[PDB]
Design a protein around this nucleic acid. Structure first.
Ligand code: MG
Ligand code: MG
Ligand code: MG
Ligand code: MG
Lengths: 209, 209
DNA sequence: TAGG
DNA sequence: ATAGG
């Protein structure tokens, strides 16, 4: 199983989980968390990294949350759309955390690390919601992240998600952009490509020492 | 001559500046900023990245700032040590910002990007202080950073600063650790080694445009 | 779990 | 675009 894949050896026992959130503004403490997608990763038989499990939830604004109109205009989210199928922060996070913990156990990792583009944004929103819903045994590292903007800057000399993906030879569709499922999925493929490219070029594994 | 080095071509026009901060706690809004060092970078004739200019300031706690005993126990800083030569947040940042702006213009970049270990920590402290002191024309990207924890995770499979440095084949002294200047300097050398390594393996420059 |  | 909503 995943115990025999080496995923747990690649990032010192950290289990990388790709996260994208859509929100009703820039403030994690006061603005509504509206949507979240999560994609766990796995290592294939040759040691290439690739997406494993995808999760996707539309989220009900927490009690008293702010909704900035320009954020809604940006992401195109109407909180009052009947077929959003919104669930509570607790419900969304509980299901994500459950799946992540299972992945961690089956992989022989010890903790999860959020992978996200300008990752402090998604981290701060995810942690605020976890606190709000008083979720227990949160498997994500409380402060460390794998920021794909920084990683893409190193590997591709690009920090903008669309451009980084394009530079890496991936498709990127402006029309699908800025939706949670799509952004998470491109970000996961981009992260996997940067790690895989490092291995291709002989940068990993390391030499004697 | 700085416009002739390619520093501005490496990171889509971002001017990387290594920052480490020492604090009287974990909260950038409520806890004192006690110390800060900055190291700007340059590219040599062969395209290798290396430290350029170093700055180092001890910082007077802002009015009403919290001072957590355990933080002081950790970093060894006595806020009321007469030898500390403390200056105001405004004075430290103004001088740091001034040197950074000079570097940006002389290298043909257009914006600085903070390089720091678990960079959200240092970024939030520098931004909080920059706001308190009403500094203008802050040259640092408002949200983007180059986190050496993530980059080291990729390049070296290590996220802890001491270990990443050792894995990169650098000296790392536990006795010098946790001083702003020493930590900034190691972080800068680490960042440069990771970037230089990527070029040595052929990952940069890229092949297909 | 290591940014003070 | 300084491009995480
Ligand atoms: Mg996003
Ligand atoms: Mg998005
Ligand atoms: Mg530090
Ligand atoms: Mg330090």
């Amino acid at each position: 199983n995943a115990q025999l894949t080496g995923l747990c050896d690649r990032f010192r026992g950290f289990y990388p989980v790709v996260i994208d959130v859509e929100t009703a503004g820039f403030n994690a403490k006061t603005d509504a968390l509206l949507e979240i997608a999560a994609i766990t990763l796995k290592m294939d038989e040759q040691g290439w990294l690739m997406p494993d499990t995808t999760l996707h939830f539309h989220v009900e604004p927490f009690v008293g949350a702010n909704l900035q109109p320009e954020a809604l205009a940006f992401n195109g989210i109407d909180p009052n759309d009947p077929d959003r199928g919104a669930v509570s922060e607790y419900e969304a996070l509980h299901e994500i955390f459950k799946v992540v913990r299972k992945g961690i156990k089956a992989s022989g990792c010890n903790r999860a690390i959020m992978v996200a583009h300008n990752a402090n944004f998604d981290h701060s929103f995810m942690m605020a919601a976890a606190e709000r819903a008083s979720l227990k045994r949160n498997p994500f590292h409380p402060f460390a992240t794998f920021d794909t903007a920084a990683l893409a800057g190193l590997a591709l000399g690009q920090t903008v998600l669309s451009k980084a993906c394009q530079t890496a030879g991936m498709d990127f569709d402006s029309t699908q952009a800025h939706s949670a499922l799509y952004d998470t999925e491109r970000t996961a493929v981009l992260f996997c490509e940067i790690v895989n490219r490092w291995k291709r070029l002989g940068g990993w594994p390391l030499s004697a020492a």
